[PDB]
């Protein structure tokens, strides 16, 4: 098994470049042939090109010549796609893969880079816990509310809570993303154990807990 | 262009089951001695994961309930059998000519047993009202099938403006569905209110589950 990991969410203005990273470890960049693909929200997937890092050799759908550029670094064992003078339509998430060591199946894949094309400012999310209202298990919450742009990773007590979790698609309300978790519990786990959600938002670079708290 | 044309766009399939999905191509994508037509699944908010390579070859560490087959421009992913964990959607690929390209994909869902939801609801957190605002949230949790129906009720009235309902993708491990369902009021509208509702309208029953609060 090999690791290939990108580099974080961006926020571009329209008309501005921005470049992303695929960092490669296990394994030598220069035996494998690099891949591009896009996903906007909710399609499916674009293949935008592909490079072979041994000799910087590059392949591009003729859809995205002049948009993106690829290349690759052997000395940090890292591939590279900019993206040039960003419009809407460049929205989407950006994945990085590697060929089966052009021709075969992509095998391994990037965790994906979420890049929004917008003129809006970032805002940081208002974090708010949610306890039960004022059995033998128990149902608590954490809303997210107001942030732009996408995405958050929401956790619970660090990840080490993670059964019993459900954590609702972000969505558009009032001109900003909200997005919700729930997670259940057995009443004799809570409030005894303290449960903590976790937000983080890379584009206001905030990472903020919030303990569930009995009402009063 | 080749262009992958995938049917179904989407199907429902029971545990245990087998079932196929077709990728048909425009052209031809073989050599003398092999397809260039590959599979991935893929969650929402997780890259694609490669399941076949070269039509029919299973790539390692996935599960021998997948294969694949074709040749020329038909080709065939089967899972047998189905299990819960395959609730995503499935693409095809082909690598024989440039540009690389992608089918539009085939969403599977689960079929299994009808489940009432679990409601809870939650006031306005004293942080929010602090900060001048006040949304009411109702989880509906682990229900099927998808198709369900949330009102807010303040004191009475019935309440659509505001309401934000979010749907999880399908638990890949009971199957089922939940919803968020969030009412964002202003802080001064909220508490000139008293009784707040989330009524949950779901096929299990005719009558609507209630959960409620006052101020």
């Known amino acids: 098994e090999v690791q290939l990991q990108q580099s974080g969410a961006e926020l571009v203005k329209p008309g501005a470049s921005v470049k992303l990273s695929c960092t490669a470890s296990?394994?030598?960049?220069?035996?494998?042939?690099f891949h591009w693909v896009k996903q906007r929200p909710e399609q499916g997937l674009e293949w935008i090109g592909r490079?072979?890092?041994?000799?910087?050799?590059?392949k591009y759908d003729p859809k995205f010549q002049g948009k993106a550029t690829i290349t690759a670094d052997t000395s940090s064992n890292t591939a590279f796609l900019q993206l040039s003078s960003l419009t809407s339509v460049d929205t989407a998430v950006y994945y990085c893969?590697?060929?089966?060591?052009?021709?075969?199946?992509?095998?391994?894949w990037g965790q994906g880079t979420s890049v929004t094309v917008s003129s809006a400012s970032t805002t940081a999310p208002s974090v708010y816990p949610l306890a039960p209202v004022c059995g033998s298990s128990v149902t608590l919450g954490c809303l997210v509310k107001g942030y732009f742009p996408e995405p958050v990773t929401l956790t619970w007590n660090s990840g080490s809570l993670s059964s019993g979790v459900h954590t609702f698609p972000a969505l558009l309300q009032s001109g900003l993303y909200t997005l919700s978790s729930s997670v259940t519990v057995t009443s004799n786990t809570w409030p005894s154990q303290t449960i903590t959600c976790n937000v983080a938002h890379p584009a206001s670079s905030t990472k903020v807990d919030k303990k569930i708290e009995p009402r009063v | 262009d080749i262009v992958l044309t995938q049917s179904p766009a989407s199907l429902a399939v029971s545990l245990g089951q087998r079932t196929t999905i077709s990728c048909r191509a425009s052209?031809?994508?073989?050599?003398?001695?092999?397809?260039?037509i590959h599979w991935y699944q893929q969650k929402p908010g997780q890259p694609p994961k490669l399941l076949i390579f070269?039509?029919?070859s299973l790539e390692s560490g996935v599960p021998a309930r997948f294969s694949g087959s074709g040749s020329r421009t038909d080709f065939t992913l089967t899972i047998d059998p189905v299990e819960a964990d395959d609730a995503a959607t499935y693409y095809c690929?082909?690598?024989?000519?440039?540009?690389?390209?992608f089918g539009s994909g085939t969403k599977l869902e689960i079929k299994r047993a009808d489940a009432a939801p679990t409601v809870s609801i939650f006031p306005p957190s004293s942080e929010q009202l602090t900060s001048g605002g006040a949304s009411v949230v109702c989880f509906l949790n682990n229900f099927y099938p998808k198709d369900i129906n949330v009102k807010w009720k303040i004191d009475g009235s019935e309440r659509q403006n505001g309401v934000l309902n979010s749907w999880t993708d399908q638990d890949s491990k009971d199957s089922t569905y939940s919803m968020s369902s969030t009412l964002t009021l202003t802080k001064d509208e909220y508490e000139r209110h008293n009784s707040y509702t989330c009524e949950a309208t779901h096929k299990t029953s005719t009558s609507p589950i209630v959960k409620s609060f006052n101020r």
């Open positions: 296990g394994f030598n960049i220069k035996d494998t042939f």
């Open positions: 893969a590697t060929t089966i060591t052009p021709y075969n199946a992509m095998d391994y």
């Open positions: 070269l039509a029919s």
């Open positions: 490079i072979d890092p041994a000799d910087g050799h590059t």
């Open positions: 052209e031809s994508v073989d050599s003398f001695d092999n397809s260039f």
């Open positions: 690929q082909q690598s024989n000519e440039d540009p690389f390209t």
